[PDB]
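agent: user wants the structure for cloq from Streptomyces roseochromogenes subsp. oscitans. delegating to structure tool.
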Amino acid sequence: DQEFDCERFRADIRATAAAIGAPIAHRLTDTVLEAFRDNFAQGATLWKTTSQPGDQLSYRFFSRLKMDTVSRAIDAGLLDAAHPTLAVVDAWSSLYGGAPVQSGDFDAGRGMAKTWLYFGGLRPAEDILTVPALPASVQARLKDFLALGLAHVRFAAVDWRHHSANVYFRGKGPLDTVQFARIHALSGSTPPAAHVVEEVLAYMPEDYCVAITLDLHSGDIERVCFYALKVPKNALPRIPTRIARFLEVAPSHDVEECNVIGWSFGRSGDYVKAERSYTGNMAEILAGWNCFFHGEEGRDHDLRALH
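agent: tool returned. relaying tokens verbatim.
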């Protein structure tokens, strides 16, 4: 059934990872799951991977239970207390007097991966990109984003291994060749062929969300990624077979089935991301954040009203 059962999820990870050829740390997971049973239990658990061969199986909860997932992570020993990105997660978490809420991304065979932050609103790039905790080099980048017209952040994702953060913007679209070209420009990636850009654009909500990855010491834009939400299996774009596999193999028990696809472009190689819901009503949490689903509205009224 559609309920969350910890013994079965344990099995589902091991199974899916084995399925897609990604490594597994049995102890480590048993701990991830012990530490955050309740969060997984009460939110929307979901799967992700990339088309990178033999890439990790990541699993994630999007909270409904608000709590300090970081202190927790440190407690269970999944995360080092002396980690030098902590002070940013705290900066960000502490905005709007504790309004934001933490979620957890983990890996089949590496453990804790990222901490996610939903800020509550369509917050100013400024608020996010200028907290004291971020070096000069990183703050320095707001002007580039504002310049591309990327005023508003909705989430931000501290990546714990690579001491870098993913910033989720929303653009006043629709997304043209040139606005795409300009954003891709930031990755330093080689420009792609016309249709690669056409395909992505085809899948875009009029008002589109784009994730930019900054190195939290250097402030460089390692890579960028464009997202298409709750795309049905029948109406997917041309995908790599690993991702094909992943969508076939990874179990979903949501009443409303929900796949996400993302084209990450980056100077060390372009890949395709995929998310897929397990338990928890992913779609329901996502509509509740005012995301937008493939072939629906697309249009942001709160956003154009500040433009």
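agent: one observation worth passing along. The radius of gyration is 18 Å.
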